[PDB]
Amino acid sequence: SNTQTVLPFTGLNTPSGVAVDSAGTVWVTDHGNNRVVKLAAGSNTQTVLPFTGLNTPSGVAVDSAGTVYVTDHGNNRVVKLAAGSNTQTVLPFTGLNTPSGVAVDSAGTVWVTDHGNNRVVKLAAGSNTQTVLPFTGLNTPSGVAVDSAGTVYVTDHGNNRVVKLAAGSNTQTVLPFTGLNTPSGVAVDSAGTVWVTDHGNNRVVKLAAGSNTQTVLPFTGLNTPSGVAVDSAGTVYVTDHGNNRVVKLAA
C-alpha cells in the first residue's frame, strides 16, 4: 500500500514507542498517560497493560515469550512485565539517565539507549553485567534496534545521524542517510533494511541493505513522529507523536 491507515487506539497523549509481533499485535507507549496500550490485529478494543508506577515511558519491546520491556524514562529504569504472571521487575541496569529506546533479541539480551548519558548499554539475560557499547560521540541518542546478525543501530538524534556497530566490530559506521533532522526512532528488518523516523522533517525514511539512496515512505500528515516498527510482512508502524495517533503502511 501507498496510503496509511490510522490504528484504532483511543486517548493517546504524545505516544512514543511502538512494537509489533508476528501475530500483528501492536504495543504503544502512551508516554503522556504513563501507560502501555496494545491492540490485537483486527480488534477495536485496546488493552491497557498492568504496568504500575510508570513515568513518561518511552521505548517498548516484546520478546518471543510475550514479556514486555518498557523504558520507564522518567524513573531512569527499564521494567519487565512477565507474561502470564504479570509480575513487574526492574532490570538491573545501573546509572541510567532518561533512557529512551529499548531492544531485545531471541537470547533475551536487552539494549537500552541511555539518552541522558550519551551511551548505549546492553544486559544479558539474568546477568549483573552491563556492557557499554563502543559507539562514540553520541548526543542525546534516541532509538536502538538490533538485527538478527547482532548489529546494533542507534539514532544519534543530537547529531542528525544514524550509526551502527556490526557484531564483533570495534568500529561504528554512519549510515548514508541524507537530510536527517533530529531523527528519533529506528527499526530494522531481517533483510537489514533500516527505517528511521526523521522526526524534525515529519517523515519516515528507509535504506535498503545494499543501498545509498534512501526512500521516503508515503506517510502523510505526520507531526514529530517518533517510534517506528516493522513486522515480518513488511508493514511499517509509526507513532505520530504530535497527532496522538499510530499509523501503519502495508508493503
Q: For domain 1-251, give the CATH number.
A: 2.120.10.30
Beta strands in 50-107 (DSSP E): 60-62, 68-72, 77-81, 88-90, 102-104
- All cell numbers assigned to 212: 545509498
In sequence order, the β-bridge partners of residue 236 are 230, 249
**Residue 105 near residue 125, CB atoms below 8 Å:** no
> Which position has the grid cell 552491563?
130
Method: X-ray
- Resolution (in Å) of the shown entry? 1.5
Residues 6+ apart with CB under 8 A from 68: 19, 27, 36, 49, 51, 60, 61, 62, 80, 81
Contacts of range 166-173, beta carbons closer than 8 Å, 24 or more positions apart: 170/134, 172/134, 172/135, 172/136
Distance CA 171, CA 136 (A): 9
**Residue 202 near residue 224, CB atoms below 8 Å:** yes
Identify residue 123 by its one-letter amino acid code. Answer: L
Q: Where are the domains of the chain?
A: 1-251
Side-by-side strand order, sheet with 186-188: 186-188, 194-198, 203-207, 215-216
Helices (H) and strands (E) in the chain, counts: 0, 24
> Which position has the grid cell 535498503?
208
User: Using alpha carbons only, how large is the chain's radius of gyration in Å?
Assistant: 16
**Residue 64 near residue 52, CB atoms below 8 Å:** no
